[PDB]
Amino acid sequence: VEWTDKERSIISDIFSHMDYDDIGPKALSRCLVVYPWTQRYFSGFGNLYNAEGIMSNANVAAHGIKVLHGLDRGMKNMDNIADAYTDLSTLHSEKLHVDPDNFKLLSDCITIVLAAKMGHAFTAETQGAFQKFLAAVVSALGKQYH
Amino acid sequence: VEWTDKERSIISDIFSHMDYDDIGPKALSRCLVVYPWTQRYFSGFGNLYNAEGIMSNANVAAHGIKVLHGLDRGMKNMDNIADAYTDLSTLHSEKLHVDPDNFKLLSDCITIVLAAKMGHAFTAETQGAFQKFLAAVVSALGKQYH
Amino acid sequence: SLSDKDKAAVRALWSKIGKSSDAIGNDALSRMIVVYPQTKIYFSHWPDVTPGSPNIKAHGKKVMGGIALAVSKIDDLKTGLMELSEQHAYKLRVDPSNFKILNHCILVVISTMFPKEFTPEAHVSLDKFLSGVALALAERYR
Amino acid sequence: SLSDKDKAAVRALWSKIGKSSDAIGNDALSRMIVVYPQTKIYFSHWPDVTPGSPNIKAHGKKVMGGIALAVSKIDDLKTGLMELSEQHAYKLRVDPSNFKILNHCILVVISTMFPKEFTPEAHVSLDKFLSGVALALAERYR
Numbered sequence A, B: 001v002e003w004t005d006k007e008r009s010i011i012s013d014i015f016s017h018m019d020y021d022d023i024g025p026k027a028l029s030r031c032l033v034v035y036p037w038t039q040r041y042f043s044g045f046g047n048l049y050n051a052e053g054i055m056s057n058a059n060v061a062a063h064g065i066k067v068l069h070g071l072d073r074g075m076k077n078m079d080n081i082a083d084a085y086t087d088l089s090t091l092h093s094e095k096l097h098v099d100p101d102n103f104k105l106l107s108d109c110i111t112i113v114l115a116a117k118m119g120h121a122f123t124a125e126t127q128g129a130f131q132k133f134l135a136a137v138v139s140a141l142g143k144q145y146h
Numbered sequence C, D: 001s002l003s004d005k006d007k008a009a010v011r012a013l014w015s016k017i018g019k020s021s022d023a024i025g026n027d028a029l030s031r032m033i034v035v036y037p038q039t040k041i042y043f044s045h046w047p048d049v050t051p052g053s054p055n056i057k058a059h060g061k062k063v064m065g066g067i068a069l070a071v072s073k074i075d076d077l078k079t080g081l082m083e084l085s086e087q088h089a090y091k092l093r094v095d096p097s098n099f100k101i102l103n104h105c106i107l108v109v110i111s112t113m114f115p116k117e118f119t120p121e122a123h124v125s126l127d128k129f130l131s132g133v134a135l136a137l138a139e140r141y142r
């Protein structure tokens, strides 16, 4: 990936105003409801069989906050995203066995939750830069898969 | 992409024994039948409305041979595939407006036609190396898209 | 496939948000052309394909009228959307890989405009419905 | 969706190649585990998941028995494959993104074994059928 100064400014502005404690839990809980086969990785997180369940679970919340902060390494050096996630890619493949199509599913939930937070400020140009960033991170998370 | 010596040997052996004049026309005609919305790019190639039509068209044949020879640049320097297709990617995007999901569709037809030619010699390890090569070329053809 | 629960959830969401159908369509199409520029070629015969275009606004009303038709025909999307499938496959020749792109843009727009109504439960049923819409629009392709 | 033409083409192809069902399944599963190693974890409870395994051969007979069941149930794959959808979604928890991988391996294997019968026309209808099989197996996932 190649980045324009305008894209860099948009990504920086999004992260500077992100309430991780709000977006992170919402994005992961939304993924667990919309793509519920992703629940099988967090079966020890406590009670989960329903959506009120999933939404309020503090384990899911703490983990969604961890995922969103896992984007920080990428946004702080977007020219090296491919090499910034090597260890995370290895962990999700070999230790956690997360199927790689799932990174894109969570990515789309992060975008949909940020869109609900930003409202009309989530312009097309904002969506384009943010989705280009998340796609770079999703590619890097799938990099160590065989 | 990273390549093992065994993968390099398999790819080299496949190309050394490839009858381009057989596989190329078959692979493109198969794509035009299985994914017939790909016919709209070759509407000047002559008569095409049916499968006997598509299969026997000499324009489709000559073009499938050109596509298969378009893999040669990649197989001759697999460590530089991403930069070996830049001009081809630009042509398919900006001049031809080929939608990028279509490269994977043709790729799968190339694999299925080679599998029919090679028969039991198309082992799992052979399929794995060949599909890894085609995926690298498909990624490079989508590289200049926006 | 859509369950009775999914159908009721889609009808109840459209009952709430359909008042803004036109605006949803303008914004979804606008986003699709900007974020997925491979799609712009399909609209290039219009006199204006730039942001703010009155052609994009007029077509956005038609697109969400197709979604409203799909909500009415939710029990049988194949038969309900057959004419629109013929139009996109034969008259327009829109590559069918693009349907999922517009579906995602529609979800993003609804999220921006109706954050309270567009809960995760509304989203799972609407996403299954838009997958069914894409498969019905794919009917005449092969 | 499958037309009468697609259904007849799938029945006629299976009528010719079904004699080798067991072999097709062994080879398709073998290829899937080697070429798409993310899938091996799902079979790791077996005592042997290496090339040539008698467990892969025994399971390949079952997989193509599921495809033969889908050919019989081709007029209504949702109802016909419901129990297999429940098994993969709930008892096995196989990620549904993997169905298209096995479908591709099945096409490759049939191409290697039946190059004369597996024409482009046989292939378009079988690919539409395997897409319908994947959607029916996805029924119990969400």
Ligand code: HEM
Binding pocket: A038, A039, A041, A042, A063, A066, A067, A068, A069, A070, A071, A088, A091, A092, A096, A098, A102, A103, A104, A106, A107, A137, A138, A141
């Ligand atoms: C694509 C965006 C993703 C990002 C940036 C990401 C980030 C991370 C982070 C930073 C960790 C913690 C690192 C550690 O354990 O040392 C983690 C762990 C984890 N992630 Fe992801 N992840 C993503 C997607 C996914 C998805 C799609 C799944 C499953 C559907 C998943 C499942 C897990 C699980 C199972 C763990 C460990 C949970 C535990 O500790 O119990 N991740 N992820």
Ligand code: HEM
Binding pocket: B038, B039, B041, B042, B063, B066, B067, B068, B069, B070, B071, B088, B091, B092, B096, B098, B102, B103, B104, B106, B107, B137, B138, B141
């Ligand atoms: C992914 C594998 C592909 C390879 C390696 C490839 C290769 C090439 C080659 C080498 C050329 C000729 C270069 C030139 O014009 O100077 C070409 C042109 C062309 N390709 Fe591709 N191509 C591929 C996929 C596709 C697909 C998927 C489509 C459409 C569905 C497509 C449509 C075309 C068309 C329309 C032309 C020009 C035809 C003409 O001259 O009338 N290509 N391709």
Ligand code: HEM
Binding pocket: C039, C042, C043, C059, C062, C063, C065, C066, C067, C084, C087, C088, C092, C094, C098, C099, C100, C101, C102, C103, C133
């Ligand atoms: C949710 C999926 C979609 C729906 C419901 C939909 C609906 C419609 C409808 C209702 C029309 C009007 C047909 C008429 O004139 O009677 C139409 C036309 C059209 N659609 Fe779509 N569409 C969808 C996706 C797409 C996509 C993904 C594209 C291209 C990327 C596309 C391109 C067009 C074009 C080019 C026209 C004709 C515009 C003109 O008349 O100038 N559609 N669509």
Ligand code: HEM
Binding pocket: D039, D042, D043, D059, D062, D063, D065, D066, D067, D084, D087, D088, D092, D094, D098, D099, D100, D101, D102, D103, D133
């Ligand atoms: C064409 C698609 C598929 C068909 C028709 C199919 C069919 C079947 C059938 C008939 C069984 C036996 C159920 C029983 O025990 O009654 C089964 C079991 C199983 N399938 Fe599939 N399957 C498909 C795809 C997949 C995929 C893609 C995977 C994983 C990547 C998978 C993993 C398994 C596992 C792990 C079992 C249980 C094995 C055991 O009992 O030890 N299946 N499948």
